[PDB]
Amino acid sequence: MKLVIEGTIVLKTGMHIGGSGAVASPVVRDTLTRLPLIPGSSLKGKMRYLLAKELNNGILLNEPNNDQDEILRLFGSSEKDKIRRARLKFNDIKLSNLAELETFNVSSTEVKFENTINRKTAVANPRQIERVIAGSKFDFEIFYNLDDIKEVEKDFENIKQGFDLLEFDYLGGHGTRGSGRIAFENLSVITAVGNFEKINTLNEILGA
Amino acid sequence: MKLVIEGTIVLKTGMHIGGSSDFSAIGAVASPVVRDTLTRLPLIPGSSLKGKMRYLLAKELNNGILLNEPNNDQDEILRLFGSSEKDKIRRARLKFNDIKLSNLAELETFNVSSTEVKFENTINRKTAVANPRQIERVIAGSKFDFEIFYNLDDIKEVEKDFENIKQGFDLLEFDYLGGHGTRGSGRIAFENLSVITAVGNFEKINTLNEILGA
Amino acid sequence: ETFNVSSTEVKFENTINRKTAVANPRQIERVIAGSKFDFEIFYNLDDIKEVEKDFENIKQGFDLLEFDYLGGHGTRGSGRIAFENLSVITAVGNFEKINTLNEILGA
Amino acid sequence: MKLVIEGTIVLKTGMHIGGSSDFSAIGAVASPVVRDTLTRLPLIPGSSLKGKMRYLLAKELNNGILLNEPNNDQDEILRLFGSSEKDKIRRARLKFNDIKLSNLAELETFNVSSTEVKFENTINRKTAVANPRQIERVIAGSKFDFEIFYNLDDIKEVEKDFENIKQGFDLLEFDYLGGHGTRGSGRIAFENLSVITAVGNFEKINTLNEILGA
RNA sequence: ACGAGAACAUACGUUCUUUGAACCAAGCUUCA
């Protein structure tokens, strides 16, 4: 049995994922439709970092293969014997609200100008940062496959923990300097094929 | 008498199947996708699609787990994908073909290449430095027109076999096809799923084409 | 050789164990797609009352093979062929109805 | 878990910050203020607040002048605002956010525009002809809420960390925040410096709320 | 009236499992 967890990532401040024309530091985008994109690798990595740091005694210093059983069963592993298949399955997230952004007569991304005033020179050496704008939304869905009936409650508690841990941190790029602040909303879980018995408890421990 | 199931595998996110470290001096890009050797198109092998469908179907007929050898699968899985035992050896009713990229003209219409490169980190929690890694992927929205040959040898099993085939396609709808799929890539979807007959019309083809096109 | 490509390739396949989630690769030489093989098959005509049914069976074998593979790991991708330019010419002995075989095989 | 620093920065002098020379329409405004792009209202960047904040702490700890790059500042600043060494990178703990305007309605009650333009004349050499020019500031008295996030990674350092955050804010009321501030712009003042946490009430909130309420 | 007739080197097998493009950086300097 498999479950799908669907929500929205709304950008409270600007965001800037990725890099590598005649301009400095572009964002990583969709390659066909040129939409700004959250890579699912970046969302999975930041969620894994925050959830592994909170599901621990404070801080997190070891390799991702050496995490707790909840983290390793939620995000996968690669060992010579203790290899596990991940239960979460993240996806690349394209920009959903181009209609909402295009209503306000603003581009989906914009260029941020900022200096580095050297102290002994007091001269600007300016640089351009492309940022997808604030108020942008990103509809995601993560596929959760159910293997243990007695562990789906703890797995979903950890998933909600990772969500509201990411609500108090940023998502990629120059984050401490203004960028990256996100927030999660419209969080729900649905079943892929054939209804789970305990779906209401998951919608109420994930809808809070 | 033999049936053909034709459809399209559309890439919802990027898809990274395959790779040979090519001898040509390509430069400072690593980890390419498997390509067609003559027409220079990225390719979905039939072996990869067959293996992922077989794993998801053998996993789905479950209650318990899936941990066995492929030859000790469920008998419906052995009659769909074949088995090679010493005595209980069954011919595979399915024949997969290598799928190459179809809508190259439409990717050229939007003036963009057929495969792209995604830059990807791994920050080590000791040192907090990033080591960038180039992973060549196929652009999402690319379409891969496949055809699988179904040879029918028992009328009393074909409806259950196509029920299981549609279930395997549905299990691929909520999983990924090849490569770094847990990190975003690999997500596919099946479109235009239809069945046609090779030669000589099957009489009850409508129930197969309506439980495959559901 | 116009495309600066070899006559043959190599194809990589893994095998994911379901118990232990680990892949062991293997390699297969394949002759690449877009390769063409000009063939000629010789038929000797013992009896004219059976030649049309024989050629009907030969074309049946050819398109039956066109919906199957030709050797090797054909269930897992490879092997798919397509016969083209199928034509019949008589070698020795003038055969009075040769165009009917040329159309039952060339259809 | 984490504890945030809610607050409100207000302007006692018309503040100038940011800039662009756009292709579409310059208009009768030279060097405009940086503004938020969707909500179209002005914005203190978190980058600007971090840069001026760090420059003032650099004026505070090693006093007077420094003539030094900001990757080799004092070690508390390397822990707080972040640093990138050769391979042994010492990470940040202090995350700023793009500060945008909150009190739109109480300026709309008095029919006052959110931003301010002034006609800054310039008298040249003894020929003595005015050289008029227009700069765009934001009106003094406008309020700006901020929510600085603070990861707790040392229990026995958050005392000194919040005391030097208050020392930096205390050094920032006696300074401008960016722009043409040297000739009468940019002067700020802090108010309503309330601290709340994400969950719980651990790593005691009372001492930090008192040392930011001082 | 060919050391020859008959005979698919064929069957089962995911190039797959790990990982944030991060960190360092007042659009500022002289303008009645």
Encode D127-163 in three state secondary structure.
Answer: CCCECCCEEEEECCCCEEEEEEEEECCCCCCHHHHHH
- Helices marked H in chain D: 46-60, 75-80, 104-108, 158-172, 205-212
| Chain A: touching chains (3 or more CB pairs < 8 Å) | B, C, D
- Could you tell me the residue range of the domain that residue D152 belongs to? 1-214
Sign for the pseudo-dihedral over CA of D16, D19, D25, D26: positive
Tokens of A77: 């592993």
Please say whether the beta carbons of C11 and B18 come within 8 A.
Answer: no
Residue labelled with tokens 């991940």: A86
User: d(Cα A199, Cα B115) in Å, to the nearest integer?
Assistant: 40
Elucidated via: cryo-EM
Please say whether the beta carbons of B7 and B178 come within 8 A.
Answer: no
Q: Within 13 Å, how many C-alpha atoms sit on residue C70's CB side?
A: 14
User: d(Cα B76, Cα B208) in Å, to the nearest integer?
Assistant: 17
Please say whether the beta carbons of B117 and B135 come within 8 A.
Answer: yes
Bridge partner residues of C11 (DSSP): C28
**In chain A, which residues from 88 to 127 place their CB closer than 7 Å to nucleic acid strand E?**
113-117, 122-124, 126
User: d(Cα B147, Cα A188) in Å, to the nearest integer?
Assistant: 36
Q: Work out the minimum CA distance from A152 to partner chain C, whole angstroms.
A: 22
The torsion angles phi and psi of B151, rounded to 5 degrees, stand at -95, 125
Strands (E), chain B: 2-11, 43-44, 94-97, 99-100, 115-120, 133-138, 143-151, 183-184, 188-197
User: d(Cα B71, Cα B78) in Å, to the nearest integer?
Assistant: 7
Resolution in Å equals: 3.0
**Concatenated DSSP letters of D181-193:** GGGT--BEEEE--
User: d(Cα A126, Cα D55) in Å, to the nearest integer?
Assistant: 18
Sequence letter at residue B173: E
Tokens of A146: 């159910």
Query: Mutate which of B61, B78, B95 to disrupt the C interface (most C C-beta within 10 Å)?
Result: B95
The torsion angles phi and psi of C16, rounded to 5 degrees, stand at -75, 115
**Concatenated DSSP letters of B50-96:** HHHHHHHHHHHS-SS---S-GGGS-HHHHHHH-B--SSS-B--SEEE
CB atoms within 10 A of CB A91: 26
User: d(Cα D142, Cα D177) in Å, to the nearest integer?
Assistant: 14
| Chain B: touching chains (3 or more CB pairs < 8 Å) | A, C, D
Q: Is A37 helix (H, G, I), strand (E, B) or coil?
A: strand
Crossing angle of helices A40-54/A152-166, nearest 10°? 100
**In chain D, which residues from 25 to 64 place their CB closer than 7 Å to nucleic acid strand E?**
31, 45, 47-48, 50-52, 54-55
Domains in chain B, number: 1
User: d(Cα C86, Cα C73) in Å, to the nearest integer?
Assistant: 26
Bridge partner residues of A48 (DSSP): none
- Within 8 A by CB and 6+ apart from A54, the residues are A161, A165, D1
**In chain A, which residues from 60 to 79 place their CB closer than 7 Å to nucleic acid strand E?**
64-65, 75-78
**DSSP-derived secondary structure letter, C57:** H
**Can you give the length of chain C in residues?**
107
- The nucleotide whose C1' lies nearest the CA of D94 is E23
User: d(Cα A27, Cα D17) in Å, to the nearest integer?
Assistant: 24
**DSSP-derived secondary structure letter, D174:** T
Cα angle, residue D167 at apex, residues D166 and D168 outer, rounded to 5°: 90
For strand E, is any atom closer than 7 Å to the CB of D181? yes
Crossing angle of helices B158-173/B46-60, nearest 10°? 100
User: d(Cα B11, Cα B143) in Å, to the nearest integer?
Assistant: 7
User: d(Cα B5, Cα B150) in Å, to the nearest integer?
Assistant: 7
Please say whether the beta carbons of B207 and B159 come within 8 A.
Answer: yes
User: d(Cα A94, Cα B13) in Å, to the nearest integer?
Assistant: 9
User: d(Cα B89, Cα B106) in Å, to the nearest integer?
Assistant: 44
Q: Work out the minimum CA distance from C19 to partner chain A, whole angstroms.
A: 10
Label residues A139-177 b or e (16+ Cβ within 10 Å = b).
ebbbbbbebeeeebeebbebbbbbbbbbbbbbbbbbbbb
Rounded alpha-carbon distances, angstroms, from residue A127 to A121, B161, D17: 17, 61, 16
User: d(Cα A164, Cα D142) in Å, to the nearest integer?
Assistant: 31
Sequence letter at residue B11: L
Cα angle, residue D89 at apex, residues D167 and A173 outer, rounded to 5°: 80
**DSSP-derived secondary structure letter, D37:** S
User: d(Cα D170, Cα A113) in Å, to the nearest integer?
Assistant: 28
Q: Is D77 helix (H, G, I), strand (E, B) or coil?
A: helix
Rounded alpha-carbon distances, angstroms, from residue A145 to A193, A196, C40, C100: 11, 12, 55, 61
Report which of A66, A77, A73 is spatially closest to residue A87, judged by C-alpha positions: A73
Please say whether the beta carbons of A26 and A132 come within 8 A.
Answer: no
Bridge partner residues of D44 (DSSP): D99
Report which of A24, A142, A35 is spatially closest to residue A86, judged by C-alpha positions: A142
- Give the DSSP H/E element, type plus range, for residue D9: strand D2-11
> Strand B2-11 and strand B94-97: pairing?
unpaired
B132-CA/E22-C1' distance, Å: 10
